[PDB]
């Protein structure tokens, strides 16, 4: 990596400057170099890695869905052939999106997950792994779409088993895991009933645990419970 000569503490400091500059590519490249120093990450440092890569991949997903739609509009009966340009550009963005996904999964597999012993670290990385297999699945069409989807499911399921046993139902990482896994059921795995059942059960168990919380923890958890409520309102 090209960050191999910069101090870990300097890479973390510059990741946070880059976030404020809304320079997410830089943010991601900094947190990549930080991971590659080989030390476990802190809670704050995990969020910077998450936030950095989600904004990079988020620009590419948005861009991919615009091009995917123009391409299909150009494949109906009564649509004028515009040449290969729309397909070539959709393929280029998709290829670039896939490289980010493979890079994030590389960091998770070398060696963030095997060294994550705590519930919070391990559940966070296994969620990340399910999310980035999910992004690969959104654009997969060929031979291992099924294997990609099962890789997402499998990582999502190990995270859910650990959070169920080791974290309270209002834990933001648990609530975010369940929000994402539900959306997986709904739009990747074609299990809308599984998607809705996970969302209600997650909302209800958290509701019944809010009484144990500080005002600050309450604002954190309720924020995410409202995302679950919104999804449910949309699917029902």
């Amino acid at each position: 990596g090209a960050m191999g000569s910069m101090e870990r503490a300097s890479l973390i400091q510059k990741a946070k400057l880059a976030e404020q500059a809304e320079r997410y590519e830089d943010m991601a490249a900094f947190m990549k170099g930080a991971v590659e120093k080989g030390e476990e990450l802190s809670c704050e440092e995990r969020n910077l890695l998450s936030v950095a890569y989600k904004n990079v991949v988020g620009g590419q997903r948005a861009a991919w869905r615009v091009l995917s739609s123009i391409e299909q509009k150009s494949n109906e009966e009564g649509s004028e052939e515009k040449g290969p340009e729309v397909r070539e550009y959709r393929e280029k963005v998709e290829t670039e999106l896939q490289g980010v996904c493979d890079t994030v999964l590389g960091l998770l597999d070398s060696h963030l997950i095997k060294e994550a012993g705590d519930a919070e670290s391990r559940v966070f990385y296994l969620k990340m792994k399910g999310d980035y297999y999910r992004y690969l699945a959104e654009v997969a069409t060929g031979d291992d779409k099924k294997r990609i989807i099962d890789s997402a499911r499998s990582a999502y399921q190990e995270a859910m088993d650990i959070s169920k046993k080791e974290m309270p139902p209002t834990n933001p990482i648990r609530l975010g895991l369940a929000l994402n896994f539900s959306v997986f059921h709904y739009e990747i795995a074609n299990s809308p009933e599984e998607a809705i059942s996970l969302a209600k059960t997650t909302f209800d168990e958290a509701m019944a645990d809010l009484h144990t919380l500080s005002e600050d923890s309450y604002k954190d958890s309720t924020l995410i419970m409202q995302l679950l409520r919104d999804n449910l309102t949309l699917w029902t």
């Binding site: 989600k54 999310d131 929000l179 959306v183 999804n231 949309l234």
Partner: peptide, 10 residues
């Protein structure tokens, strides 16, 4: 109106 996943984009 798009379904929510976390984290959210800037």
């Amino acid at each position: 109106p798009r379904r929510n996943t976390l984290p959210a984009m800037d």
